[PDB]
């Protein structure tokens, strides 16, 4: 078993995690390049595999606590960059990829928190430190 | 931690917040200009970053209490303008952007309130007072 | 605070509200005419404002109680007209717009009411009595 | 107030209601023929009204009890017809329209009923008996 | 009233029902061939009726209990056929139609069942035994 | 009855199941090649059957426990392959198909687990060991 | 001080109290329409007041003594009506409201009485004679 | 006053009461179909009345004495039926309704009786012999 | 020590306590806005504090003695208001808040009193006179 | 009359009762499949009867005396089985059903017994030996 | 053995216990983050442990004696804070945690005391002085 | 018969029982994975058995006497672990399972003891020494 407190996204400025990090989710994708020739041993769909583009997307939720890493993401959004982002998996290790800052949003209610979602997507080739 | 009572949207007439402000949510966006060349170190999707257009959208909910700032939004809608709007983040600061008044709606039930949603979207270059 | 019992939609025949008026909701819109030139001080989306068309839509729910104003809406639907409709906001005032009768529906169950939704949309220039 | 037990859909064979009639809902529509000229007193959307086509749709739910009127709907579906259907509104009166039998479905579970939905749509000019 | 235990889908091999048959639902359709001429006594939509194609779709849910009729459906899927399927309605009778085996799926959790959905659709002319 | 603990997806490296396997679901498909000629004994839709392509999709949920089979799926994703995957059905048997690793995602919260979904789709002709 | 023997519920047939009236309890309600705007002088919850629906419920206990007023309540239950009911408060006065007969129950033991509870709820606008 | 020994539930086989009948309680219900329109003379809740479904439930307690009427209830439970049940009210009269045998339970202790509860609920239209 | 006879709720008409005041209980609340970030020095739950809404509720029991202050509460209920209410704490002092009259109920038995409960809840910002 | 000492639950190993059997209670259930069509002679709820699933639950209390039948229940719980259980009714006879061992619990105090509850529920079709 | 007079809750102003402290109860919690993988040596539920959030709640009862520490809690409630609270365990030691003042209530009867409950909950990381 | 003084819960540090152990109760559970197919010989509910997850929960009450095993549980709670716990059944034997320390609470009154409840739940696979 691995603690959900262990997997951490973190910005550059040298890497530090953001403050409100209530729920985060790295999500990989591939578009499944269908190569269905007429011949196929039972009429099954055949796929190519390595031809497909592959992606990554980070969706971080949290409560707005002011930190320099939280101010950094605003500066990354206004001065639109694609810097290095890094996401630990507990016992796998970090990812250390270039991402962008696709859509952030700050929210607040009459009774609750200052909360924020932070949605990111892949911008380059990723890595894995094991 | 930051109080959700602190983040406030406010109209011009000089800036004052609207009356029913039950839930508000500034939401930024970027359309992620995909620049996927054939070469990429693992077949990863590459992104450009700063080429993407960037936006902002404000969705304010609340209960209809008559105020001059609430009458102002009706006047902003009928006389269709794009005036300056300003949204505080608690410990970041204000935004102070030109927005429009994209869609408002007043609602009432047989037993509940006169309530209203107020949806806005970005209309120009934004700012940040820190 | 304003009572939800106060905001009232009403038909012409001279104006009278309909019988079952369980939940009603005037909803305004504008389509946000995007004018995004290449220049923009941070790559922000610029909007025009007053060029956008603007609309209104009324969605009234209620229980079927037979009234002359309820029979009027059937006559407005079959003899398809766009007469004047009027919606009070409690402390703002009336709207007094020409609408049509876009979609109505009567519903009933084995145990419940004869209920109806009544969906309307803008058909002309609106007003505001303050 | 009007009882939901009063509003009844009924088939021809002379008119009789179907057996399982748990929830029924006549639903009218019009497609809102937008006539938005450049001139309009506040930039409001103008509509034409009577040019729009108008429709009706009946969605009847119920439990499968075998009746001749329930067998009739199967015969109306296989021998595809558009016969006269009639829906009472409690204190308005009947509708008496030609409809078709667009989609029916029979359902059953390991523990529950033999249930059925019966979806109809308008096929001609409707009426109103007052 | 009719028991939901009575309505049964069944495969050929001679007809036998499948093992896990938790919830099943035959669903008929017609696409409603709109014939809306300019003339129509109130501007009502006119429909043709018998010109529309008509269909049937069976969605059977259940828990995976191994039976020869359950193995048959796998053989019907891999060796893609359109054999005769038969669905009883309690007091109507059987349907006895040619269907295909459009999409099946087996599912299991860490604590629950081996469950399966079985989705079918019409493949020919249907029948009714009364 | 069959235990949901019995149906197991498993990777190659020789086959071993993955660690967190909270909910898994093989899902087959066929696109239903509609062959609707003008003649049909009641206007019923006719289908061809064996002409349709047929597919399979595996959606595995689970909690991130580090295993070599869990590291294998990351290596299958970055070095994009279409290796053999194998899914037991309790009393049917295995499937043993070539699949790809279409989209995986790792997720974690401030209080919960390191969890992951693992979505796969068919890449070749499948099998069945009975 | 006021005698509990004085407060009396009574049916119409002209008003007479029921026979076994061991314990009776009129109970009023309001659902407290919460209008909590973001501003509030100490973060206190603000309420609207008059927007809330208001109700009444009568729970009468007693021993089954046969009377015409006791037979009346059975006739009110089977022929489901909402007639006028009247409840005296000793020195306030009567209420004289339309109620329904929501749930009655007759009970008896091997040694005790024929007893009954009689639960009623508001059905219209109430009154007060002072 | 009426003796609690007089009110008797009784099964069919011709009607005979069950043996252990320590405490019995017929209980009627109606779900109170709320029809609360926006207009109401003091904001009072309005109710419809006759639209509500109405029910009956019998809860019989007693000590297990073997009788043919006690064996009958076991046969009614295993061979699940909805036969006629009849409950006398002392000076009102019988009820004579179709009920089912919803939940029975036999209980015994190391020192006490063989006791049983017998819970029934309405299954059809009831009656009243006066 | 402080006498329970000292703490007194009182209505406006100028403030006077109600007659039967057998047991009274002001009760304050806050909904505890949970702000649990992933970081926390032992995994402890962190809370925000001042963001939570805060309330007050008064539950007064007593015997119905007719007084003008007791008639006032009936008038406050029928003419639904939110007037000022005031509750002394013996050596703290008064509260002097706006409340509503949420649910009152009058009760009487065949042998006991005319008794009443009186339940109130906060409607505005409260105070404290020290 | 029947002795509570006579009704006995008993395990298989051939059937023997457990040691501490202070209070035991077989409890049957049915979920009452509501079939309420719009028509019903007085608006009464109609029920289907035999469509409902039916269950059984055994709750045995007792003091922990070590017996092989008491050790058997621990072995039935750890090696999770659904073996045959048998419950005598004094003059009815046995039940002889397959049950599971849903929840057991051992309890002891500083002064009292080693006591245990043993809760079981139905797992198959039951019987009755008369 | 340890005296219940020894365990004491105490406020800051430097720490002093409150006056009426009739019954007090610190209560800790953890939400038990269920990590139940499909594999488990007997089908047992597996738990993670340290991932769960952990809490504390203090419920203090007492009689209202006016003290500065009792006035402090009112000031902590109106000026909503989360100050340090401290609870001795007799021979363990203090806790010294930040709590809030979630719900207090003052109560009094016609014959008894001015009594109060004081309910608190954890607001931060706690401690232990041993 | 078995003494309640014999069944003992005990912590690790090697195993020792806690000091105040006034009432303790191991409680096992299984969630009863319902596998109710449409076929069942009398419409009885069928269950699977071994698919259900199985649990254990320990609720220990006692008076706070300071011991190293009592200090251990505080250390187990703050440093959140899931160590081995062991519960003797008198003549069965020990259990020896991994549990967590889900919720403890210390309580004291103005006249009584320092008392504590200690609630635990299963965290892994259990055992049985016979």
Numbering used by the authors:
A (entry chain D), B (entry chain D), C (entry chain D), D (entry chain D), E (entry chain D), F (entry chain D), ...: 3 to 15, 20 to 136
The authors write:
The RcGTA tail contains five discs of tail tube proteins (major tail proteins) (Rcc01691, g9), which are organized as a six-entry helix with a twist of 24.4° and pitch of 38.3 Å. The structures of the stopper, tail terminator and tail tube proteins have been determined to a resolution of 3.6 Å, and that of the distal tail protein to 4.0 Å. The N-terminus, short loop, and loop β2-β3 of the tail tube protein enable its binding to tail terminator proteins. The long loop of the tail tube protein mediates interactions between the tail tube proteins from successive discs and between the tail tube protein and distal tail protein. The part of the tail channel of RcGTA formed by the tail tube and distal tail proteins is filled by a trimer of tape measure proteins (Rcc01694, g11).
Gene transfer agents (GTAs) are DNA-containing phage-like particles produced by some species of bacteria and archaea. The genes encoding proteins that form Rhodobacter capsulatus GTA particles (RcGTA) are derived from phage DNA, which has been integrated into the bacterial genome. Here, we use cryo-electron microscopy (cryo-EM) to determine the structures of RcGTA before and after DNA ejection, and to visualize the interactions of RcGTA with R. capsulatus cells. Particles of RcGTA have heads with a diameter of 38-nm and 49-nm long tails.
